[PDB]
Amino acid sequence: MNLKEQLCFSLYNAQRQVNRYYSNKVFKKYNLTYPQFLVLTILWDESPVNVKKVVTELALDTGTVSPLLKRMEQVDLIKRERSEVDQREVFIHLTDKSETIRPELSNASDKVASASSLSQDEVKELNRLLGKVIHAF
Amino acid sequence: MNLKEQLCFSLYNAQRQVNRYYSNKVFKKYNLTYPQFLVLTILWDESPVNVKKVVTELALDTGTVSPLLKRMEQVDLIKRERSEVDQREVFIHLTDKSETIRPELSNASDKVASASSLSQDEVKELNRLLGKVIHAF
Numbered sequence: 001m002n003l004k005e006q007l008c009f010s011l012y013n014a015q016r017q018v019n020r021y022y023s024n025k026v027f028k029k030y031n032l033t034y035p036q037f038l039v040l041t042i043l044w045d046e047s048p049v050n051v052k053k054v055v056t057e058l059a060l061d062t063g064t065v066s067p068l069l070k071r072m073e074q075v076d077l078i079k080r081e082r083s084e085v086d087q088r089e090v091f092i093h094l095t096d097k098s099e100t101i102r103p104e105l106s107n108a109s110d111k112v113a114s115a116s117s118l119s120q121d122e123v124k125e126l127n128r129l130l131g132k133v134i135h136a137f
Numbered sequence: 138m139n140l141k142e143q144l145c146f147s148l149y150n151a152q153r154q155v156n157r158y159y160s161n162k163v164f165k166k167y168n169l170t171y172p173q174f175l176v177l178t179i180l181w182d183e184s185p186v187n188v189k190k191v192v193t194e195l196a197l198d199t200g201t202v203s204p205l206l207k208r209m210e211q212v213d214l215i216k217r218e219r220s221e222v223d224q225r226e227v228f229i230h231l232t233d234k235s236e237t238i239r240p241e242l243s244n245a246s247d248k249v250a251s252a253s254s255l256s257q258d259e260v261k262e263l264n265r266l267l268g269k270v271i272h273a274f
Binding site for chain 2: 001003004005006007008009010011012013014015016017018020021034035037038041042045057058059108109112113115116117118122123124125126127129130131132133134136137
């Protein structure tokens with residue numbers, strides 16, 4: 001069969017590739033992991049943010065979020081803060097270390113698009129199709 | 138910003154989702170992992186195959202293949218065979234256990250496409266765009 005025609009292989013590999021790249025080009029210089037990277041991405045866009053947003057923007061399950069963020073805190077990448085008004089609410093803050101990394105990975109979703117000869121219309125459609133895959137369940 | 142517009146998030150999540158689904162719907166019934174699944178996918182299409190093909194169809198690095206296949210062997214999912222003609226050549230065979238799973242996951246790349254309301258043309262383009270992302274480096 002044609003595996004280029006196999007979405008299962010296409011998705012797996014696309015992501016796999018993009019992670020591979022970044023893992024070498026940057027992640028190691030700072031000891032990051034793709035998801036951690038995504039979190040910072042969210043934080044670089046929004047100074048302090050509610051943990052619930054991280055859980056939303058990523059395929060996070062129960063008690064998978066808390067751990068991830070705990071690790072990032074241990075490594076001074078983010079600072080967590082629990083509300084005094086409702087103690088089950090938690091916010092996330094950028095740290096200076098994570099503020100530093102900003103210039104290196106903030107442009108990411110495009111270093112990609114450019115390195116993939118993807119047009120403005122193509123990217124919009126890719127994200128569109130991927131969207132369908134995402135909510136597909 | 139719009140994260141739906143963020144390829145980085147789109148790719149990550151798409152795959153993440155598709156794996157999530159299958160991990161629950163099937164993988165557990167047999168104790169599989171996405172890549173292992175991909176390998177079987179290749180084997181279901183080709184009775185015995187050269188390990189080099191697995192390394193090719195997946196983003197496999199050095200000594201990442203050997204381990205993966207070793208595990209699959211330990212669990213009677215595949216049977217490895219080393220050539221007597223050139224001892225660094227190795228072939229992979231389906232086992233009865235893995236032959237059994239065939240009906241459950243052989244259709245996969247489409248259970249997906251269908252569950253994602255993706256047309257024949259859309260799928261072709263998704264795979265196409267993803268292709269660009271893949272060789273993007």
